RNA sequence: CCGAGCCUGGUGAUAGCUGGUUGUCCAAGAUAGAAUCUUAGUUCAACUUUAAAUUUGCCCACAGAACCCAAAUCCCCUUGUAAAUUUAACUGUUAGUCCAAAGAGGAACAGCUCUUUGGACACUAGGAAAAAACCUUGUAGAGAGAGUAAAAAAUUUAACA
């Protein structure tokens, strides 16, 4: 997980976009999302997500 | 279409924005006399002068604030000098 | 066959909309514009204490102009000419 | 409404633009009342600048009736015979003047919808398009899949 | 006169005969008519293109419902081209 | 013309051409109607406009040898 | 105007199509090598001021 | 509906676009690391 | 130009008889192009009010090929009108019964859903084999090309191509093959 | 629930390659931000829309000048997603009183003090 | 046509209840809640409107705002901008739906119900199939001019010494 989040070629990551609030996405998002960035949705957990 | 190309080249994305296709006069007398300016170009140019005057005043006020900070720092320097001279 | 329960866009069960590369490209464009916006927002030109007390003068003149325009409220002027020009309707050639 | 209203193709009278331009407003006939607050505008117009109008436009002809009328009218006919009646009842002098000037500028053809904002009697150059313009020919003219 | 072309004002008869007469006045051979393109020959709307060629060179092409209409129209085209009344000619100067 | 043409970048030179056009008539356009209507709200409004229009005729076009 | 031109004078529209095809080929040469080459002659642009 | 649900609660379209753009782009060389090396 | 008005109009808005061969082509592309030509979009004078269509004829619909397993996947469905008349026939059986129905209905779907659809479908023509009535292999204009290529077979590949093509690997001798 | 989002200041800390790619010299920085509204003010909170109203950008695709100072950069950060911004460029120095009229903008964020309106 | 007749008069009985409510054009304009034999209503507050007097009004910079046992918030000079308060006169709204988020009830069901922050709708336009509530987008006209916005789902699956 750590090496994938280090080596991903995506210049755009949920943590960056959320901490930036670059399209008012804090609207659709929750404050819990700041720590539940991409992996979590309710009770589920997608480990492949980054 | 092509607006991105026009932008990368330096022209307006919309040809109606600025350039020779829109700023030039649309008609002149058959004798070669100059036509009066049209209202669209007149208002655009007035807006441009307002914009430029605004830029000038903004820059002048920023420079004045910077210079005032410099003067105030010099005041502080000379008044500390006064203090330790006392 | 092929029915959706209730309304098509709301509720516990709805029609699942999906993403298209068109929208993906659009949003990456928006956010890269926003990234260069962040960059240019960085590196300010002046500091707080530098920019503290420069525009208060202009703001003061603006607000006093507004006060003057607001206080300038009265009836308009009335004139003998404007009153008596109503007499011009009954004219006729002699 | 366009479909309720008739239409015409854009055209000019007698091709006025090619040769010498001619003011194709032929006649004006004003009908005004001596009395009546409604005719004050027409009376002051005749006082000030109907003279200047006629002097500026010698080709046009002007008649004035000056007879009792509850409403002042202006009648105008053109070269084609196109009639134009207008009521200047309770109308200011500057707008009356603009009205007369626009009638002088106007031509002898009734105002209706124009299908096309232009007209070209010589539209086509290099030959009008037909399906066979942009495709080659065949050796001694053979249709596809034909021996002789 | 600007608008309408020649043969709306000045009607003629035997345009191909007049054409051969004119060509022999100009001292050239009598050209032959040849269908260049055709479509729907059996169809209720026959369509032919006739060209008038002298010495293996063309002068005028003309469309037509049938071969006769096409060849007479091509003759008319040749007449217009010879007399210089082509619709694409110099407009009247002023 | 029949056998050639001249493109601009964007527009051709001034003295290269000379397009003369004469004005022939000024008139009010035939009355165009604009109304806005809404449903079950008694929102209905009408207005009539007569836009001005001018007609020109292009007299002649000529080309200069200045290339 | 592109429409009515292609209608009434197809030779000019064919000229425009050839122009466009050549500009496509110039753009492909540029996609191959952007700089380090002589830019296309028709791809050249005019600078206004 | 509630935040946590038994089923996967369908999310807002903006959020689903964001999640569809944000993925692990695996860093691959131009050449596969078996045939050539 | 220097043409007469009525002949010019006639030649301009005249119809054209296009031909195509259906030997190993996709009915999708064939119907797309046939719809373009029937509508008359290829004519730059196109507008819906004037029926500027053109007649199209296709040959050898029997020798048509789909892409994919569509011969089995696809299901042409129609209701006769009575209860239990909701019949379905795969493309294969529908072709065995009528080899043209596929292409004609494909174009029926391609074309707009106005009443002009039926007229343009009437103008269309169809032949499962390389044989035509005299009138309508006479009154033709042009045979435009096919959308796709036809891959060659081993019996079709000449020897010089095989020789120019380099061999890739060396087998060991000890192998039954 | 939805609230005003605080931005960590670490977001606005340029990197070396960021400088190298944007060509923005941190030393001798610009003075003025040209700004234009790209996003709808609808479906946006009252504070965002009234803040852009205060800045005076009710009209879209209208380049408008603001200062480069923290008090304004605050609002710019608040409504950053709604706007395309770029610093001011000028080679020809400030517009002189004689050239007040022959001014023109460029898509590259530059301001020409003279406008001859013909090619080189 | 008798749970108690028909006729006349009071009587134009009353009805928070249903319905209806006539010419043109323009502008501003849905907005916390409390009490009520009160929840189909009304009164006050708030919002909205009109005309005036006055000056500060919105955003907000450091600092500041609890022991118990997170997103944010209040105040807040500067700066960006031009609104706000007060005075005088009323009316009307005061039975509200979805979405995102923080929670409760319920079955961690509801196109369910209830509070809070926000948005849209009950105003026009484009798109997602038709679509209120989803995404783009608002100040209004004539155009047979142009550049963009959001805007089209991708998937096929298991041999073994
Ligand atoms: Mg339903
Ligand atoms: Mg929720
Ligand atoms: Mg009773
Ligand atoms: Mg009553
Ligand atoms: Mg009640
Ligand atoms: Mg309004
Ligand atoms: Mg304050
Ligand atoms: Mg509900
Ligand atoms: Mg509910
Ligand atoms: Zn390999």
- E strand or H helix at J33: strand J32-37
DSSP sequence for B16-52: TTSSHHHHS-S---TTSPPPPPPHHHHHHHHHHHHHH
Domain tally for chain I?
A: 1
What is the spatial distance between Cα I46 and Cα I53, in angstroms, rounded to a whole number?
9
Query: What are the b/e assignments for B6-16, b being 16+ CB within 10 Å?
Result: beeeebbeeee
For residue B21, give both structure tokens.
């296709």
Report the alpha-carbon angle J67-J68-J69, nearest 5.
Answer: 100
CA distances from residue B36 to B18, B28, D98, E10, H6 in whole angstroms, order as listed: 19, 9, 21, 49, 74
For residue I14, give both structure tokens.
């005249």
**For residues A29 and H19, is the Cβ–Cβ distance under 8 A?**
no
DSSP sequence for chain A: -HHHHHH---S--HHHHHHHTSSSTTTTS-GGGGTSTTTEETTEE-TT--
Residues of chain F with Cβ-Cβ distance to B20 below 8 Å are: 10-11
Nucleotide nearest to J66 (CA to C1'): K80
What is the spatial distance between Cα I134 and Cα I136, in angstroms, rounded to a whole number?
6
Contacting residues 15-74/J vs strand K (CB within 7 A): 37-47, 50-51, 54-56, 58, 60-61, 66-67, 69-72, 74
What is the spatial distance between Cα D50 and Cα D30, in angstroms, rounded to a whole number?
10
- E strand or H helix at D30: strand D25-31
Minimum Cα–Cα distance from I44: chain D residue = D129
Which residue, chain included where needed, has tokens 């009265």?
Answer: C74
Report the Cα I10 to chain-centroid distance in Å: 28
Return the closest-CA partner of residue D20 out of I9, I151, E94, B4.
E94
Residues 6+ apart with CB under 8 A from G5: G12, G13
Who among A7, A10, A44 is closest to H22 (CB)? A10
Q: Which domain holds residue I54?
A: 1-177
**For residues E90 and F60, is the Cβ–Cβ distance under 8 A?**
no
- SS3 at position F47: strand
Chain C interface, best mutation among B57, B62, B73, B74, by max C CB count within 10 A:
B62
Q: Which positions on strand K lie below 7 Å from a protein C-beta?
A: 24-26, 51-61, 70-73, 77-84, 98-103, 105-106, 108-112, 116-124, 128-131, 133-139, 141-153
- What single-letter DSSP state applies at residue I32? H
For residue I9, give both structure tokens.
């109009």
SS (H, E, C) chain E: CCCCCHHHHCCCCCHHHHHHHHHHHCCCCCCEEEEEEEECCCCCCCEEEEEEEECCEEEEEEEECCHHHHHHHHHHHHHHHHHCCCCCCCCCCC
For residue F58, give both structure tokens.
């292009």
Locate the DSSP E strands across F29-65: 32-37, 44-49, 52-63
What is the spatial distance between Cα I132 and Cα I147, in angstroms, rounded to a whole number?
23
> Up-side HSE of residue C1: CA atoms within 13 Å toward CB?
0
| Domain spans of chain J, in order of start | 1-117
**For residues I25 and I65, is the Cβ–Cβ distance under 8 A?**
yes
For residue I146, give both structure tokens.
């096919």
Report the alpha-carbon angle I74-I77-I79, nearest 5.
Answer: 175
Residues recorded for chain A: 50
Residues of chain B with Cβ-Cβ distance to G47 below 8 Å are: 10
CA distances from residue E21 to E17, E72, I155 in whole angstroms, order as listed: 6, 15, 64
The helix, strand and coil proportions of chain F, stated in percent and rounded to the nearest 5, come to: 0, 55, 45
CA distance D128 to chain G (A): 5
Minimum Cα–Cα distance from G7: chain I residue = I44
A23 touches strand K (CB under 7 A): yes
Asked whether the CA dihedral D137, D138, D141, D143 is positive or negative, the reply is: negative
Chains B and J touch (3+ CB pairs under 8 A): yes
Chains F and D touch (3+ CB pairs under 8 A): yes
CA distances from residue I30 to B52, G20, I38, I60, I142 in whole angstroms, order as listed: 61, 28, 12, 12, 16
What is the spatial distance between Cα G43 and Cα G22, in angstroms, rounded to a whole number?
9
Contacting residues 9-68/C vs strand K (CB within 7 A): 9-13, 15-18, 20, 22-23, 26-27, 29-30, 48, 51-56, 58-59, 62-63, 66-67
Q: Which domains does chain D possess?
A: 1-148 (3.40.30.10)
- Burial class from Cβ neighbours inside 10 Å (0-12, 13-18, 19+) for residue I141 reads buried
Residues 6+ apart with CB under 8 A from I158: none
Residues 6+ apart with CB under 8 A from I135: E42
CB proximity H21 to C under 8 Å: yes
Which residue, chain included where needed, has tokens 């409403």?
Answer: D71
- E strand or H helix at I56: strand I55-59
**For residues I48 and I112, is the Cβ–Cβ distance under 8 A?**
no
What is the spatial distance between Cα J107 and Cα B9, in angstroms, rounded to a whole number?
9
DSSP sequence for D67-89: ---SS-EEEEEETT--EEEEE-T
According to DSSP, the β-strands at I17-21 and I55-59 are parallel
What is the spatial distance between Cα E26 and Cα E79, in angstroms, rounded to a whole number?
13
- SS3 at position I65: coil
What is the spatial distance between Cα B63 and Cα D35, in angstroms, rounded to a whole number?
73
Return the closest-CA partner of residue I138 out of E67, D148, D133.
D148
Please report which ligand is nearest the Cα atom of J1: 2
- SS3 at position D15: coil
What is the spatial distance between Cα C27 and Cα D8, in angstroms, rounded to a whole number?
50
- Longest alpha-carbon distance in chain B: 85
Which residue, chain included where needed, has tokens 């369908």?
Answer: H10
What is the spatial distance between Cα I110 and Cα I28, in angstroms, rounded to a whole number?
9
> Up-side HSE of residue J14: CA atoms within 13 Å toward CB?
22
- What single-letter DSSP state applies at residue I5? H
Which residue, chain included where needed, has tokens 């301001």?
Answer: J111
CA distances from residue G8 to D134, E64, F1, J46 in whole angstroms, order as listed: 13, 20, 12, 56
Who among C12, C16, C28 is closest to H21 (CB)? C28
J5 touches strand K (CB under 7 A): yes
Return the closest-CA partner of residue E66 out of E85, E42, E88, E84.
E42
Hey, how many other C-beta atoms are within 10 angstroms of the C-beta on I110? 18
For residue I66, give the CATH number of its domain.
3.90.1180.10
- What single-letter DSSP state applies at residue J62? -
- What single-letter DSSP state applies at residue D39? G
Asked whether the CA dihedral D17, D21, D22, D24 is positive or negative, the reply is: positive
In terms of DSSP H, where are the helices of chain I? 5-13, 27-39, 70-73, 91-97, 101-110, 116-123, 135-138, 159-164
**For residues H12 and A41, is the Cβ–Cβ distance under 8 A?**
no
Q: I5-13 and E67-83 helices cross at what angle (nearest 10)?
A: 120
> Up-side HSE of residue I96: CA atoms within 13 Å toward CB?
5
Neighbouring-strand partners of residue D63: D29
Which residue, chain included where needed, has tokens 């119907």?
Answer: I31
What is the spatial distance between Cα C93 and Cα E1, in angstroms, rounded to a whole number?
53
**For residues I112 and I53, is the Cβ–Cβ distance under 8 A?**
no
For residue E74, give both structure tokens.
């091509």
Technique behind the model = cryo-EM
What is the spatial distance between Cα D87 and Cα C55, in angstroms, rounded to a whole number?
61
């Amino acid at each position: 997980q750590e090496e994938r989040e280090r080596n991903n070629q995506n210049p755009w990551t949920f943590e960056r976009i959320a901490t930036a609030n670059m399209l008012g996405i804090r609207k659709v998002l929750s404050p819990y999302d700041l720590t539940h960035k991409g992996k979590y949705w309710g009770k589920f957990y997608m480990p492949k997500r980054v | 279409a092509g607006g991105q190309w026009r932008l990368q080249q330096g022209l307006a994305a919309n040809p109606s924005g600025y350039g020779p296709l829109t700023e030039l006069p649309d008609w002149s007398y058959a004798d070669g006399r100059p036509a009066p300016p049209m209202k669209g170009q007149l208002r655009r140019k007035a807006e441009r002068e307002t914009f430029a005057r605004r830029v000038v005043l903004l820059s002048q006020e920023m420079d004045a604030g910077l210079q005032a900070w410099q003067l105030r720092q010099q005041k502080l320097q000379e008044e500390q000098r006064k203090q330790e001279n006392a | 066959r092929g029915r959706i329960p209730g309304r098509q866009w709301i509720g516990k069960h709805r029609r699942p909309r999906f993403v298209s590369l068109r929208a993906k490209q659009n949003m990456i464009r928006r956010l890269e514009i926003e990234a260069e916006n962040h960059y240019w927002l960085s590196m300010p030109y002046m500091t707080r204490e530098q920019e503290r007390g420069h525009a208060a003068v202009r703001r003061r003149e603006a607000f006093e102009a507004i006060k003057a325009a607001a206080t300038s409220k009265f009836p308009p002027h009335r004139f003998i000419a404007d009153q008596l020009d109503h007499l011009n309707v009954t004219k006729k050639w002699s | 409404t366009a479909r309720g209203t008739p239409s015409r193709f854009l055209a000019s009278v007698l091709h006025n633009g090619l040769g010498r331009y001619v003011q194709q407003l032929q006649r004006l006939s004003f009908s005004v009342s001596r009395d009546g607050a409604s005719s004050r505008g027409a009376r002051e117009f005749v006082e000030r600048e109907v003279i200047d109008f006629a002097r500026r436009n010698p080709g046009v002809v002007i008649y004035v009736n000056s007879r009792p009328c509850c409403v002042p009218r202006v009648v105008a006919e053109y070269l084609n015979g196109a009639v134009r009646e207008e009521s200047i009842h309770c109308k200011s002098v500057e707008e009356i003047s603009t009205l007369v000037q626009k009638l002088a500028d106007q031509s002898g053809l009734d105002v209706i919808r124009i299908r096309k904002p232009f007209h070209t009697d010589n539209p086509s150059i290099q030959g009008q398009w037909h399906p066979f313009t942009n495709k080659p020919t065949t050796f001694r003219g053979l249709r596809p899949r034909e021996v002789q | 006169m600007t608008g309408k072309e020649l043969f709306e004002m000045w009607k003629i008869i035997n345009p191909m005969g007049l054409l051969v007469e004119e060509l022999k006045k100009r001292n050239v051979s009598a050209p032959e008519s040849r269908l260049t393109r055709q479509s729907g020959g059996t169809t209720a709307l026959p369509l032919y293109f006739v060209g008038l060629y002298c010495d293996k060179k063309l002068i005028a092409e003309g469309p037509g419902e049938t071969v006769l209409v096409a060849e007479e129209e091509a003759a008319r085209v040749a007449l217009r081209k010879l007399y210089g009344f082509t619709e694409n000619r110099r407009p009247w100067n002023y | 013309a029949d056998n050639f043409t001249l493109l601009g970048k964007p527009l051709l030179g001034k003295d290269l051409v000379r397009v003369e056009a004469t004005v022939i008539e000024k008139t009010e356009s035939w009355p165009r109607i604009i109304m806005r209507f809404r449903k079950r709200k008694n929102f209905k409004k009408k207005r009539i406009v007569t836009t001005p229009q001018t007609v020109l005729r292009i007299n002649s076009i000529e080309i200069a040898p200045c290339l | 105007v592109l429409a009515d031109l292609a209608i009434y004078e197809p030779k000019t529209f064919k000229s425009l199509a050839a122009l466009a095809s050549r500009r496509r080929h110039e753009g492909f040469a540029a996609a191959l090598g952007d700089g380090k080459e002589p830019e296309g002659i028709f791809s050249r642009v005019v600078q206004y001021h | 509906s509630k935040a946590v649900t038994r089923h996967r609660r369908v999310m807002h379209f903006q959020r689903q676009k964001l999640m569809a753009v944000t993925e692990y782009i695996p860093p691959k060389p131009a050449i596969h690391p078996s045939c050539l090396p | 130009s220097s043409f007469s008005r009525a002949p010019q109009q006639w030649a301009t808005f005249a119809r054209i008889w296009y031909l195509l061969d259906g030997k190993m082509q996709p009915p999708g592309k064939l119907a797309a192009m046939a719809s373009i030509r029937l509508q008359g979009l290829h004519k730059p004078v196109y507008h819906a009010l004037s029926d500027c269509g053109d007649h199209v004829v296709i040959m050898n619909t029997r020798h048509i090929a789909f892409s994919g397993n569509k011969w089995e996947q696809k299901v042409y469905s129609s209701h006769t009108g009575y209860p239990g008349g909701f019949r379905q026939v795969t493309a294969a059986q529908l072709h065995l019964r009528d080899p043209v129905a596929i292409v004609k209905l494909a174009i029926y779907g391609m074309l707009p859903k106005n009443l002009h659809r039926r007229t343009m479908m009437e103008r269309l023509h169809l032949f499962p084999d390389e044989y035509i009535p005299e009138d309508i292999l006479k009154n033709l204009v042009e045979e435009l090309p096919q959308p796709r290529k036809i891959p060659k077979r081993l019996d079709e590949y000449t020897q010089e191509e095989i020789d120019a093509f380099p061999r890739l690997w060396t087998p060991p001798e000890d192998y039954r093959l | 629930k939805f609230t005003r989002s605080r931005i960590p200041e670490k977001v606005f800390q340029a990197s070396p390659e960021d400088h190298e790619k944007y060509g923005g010299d941190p030393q001798n920085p610009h003075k003025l931000h040209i700004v234009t509204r790209i996003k709808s003010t609808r479906r946006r909170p009252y504070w965002e829309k009234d803040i852009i109203k205060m800045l005076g950008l009710e009209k879209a695709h209208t380049p408008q000048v603001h200062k480069n100072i923290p008090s304004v950069n605050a609002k710019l950060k608040v409504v950053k997603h709604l706007i395309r911004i770029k610093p001011l460029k000028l080679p020809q120095g400030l517009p002189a009183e004689e050239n007040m009229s022959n001014t023109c903008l460029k898509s590259t964020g530059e301001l020409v003090v003279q406008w001859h309106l013909k090619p080189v």
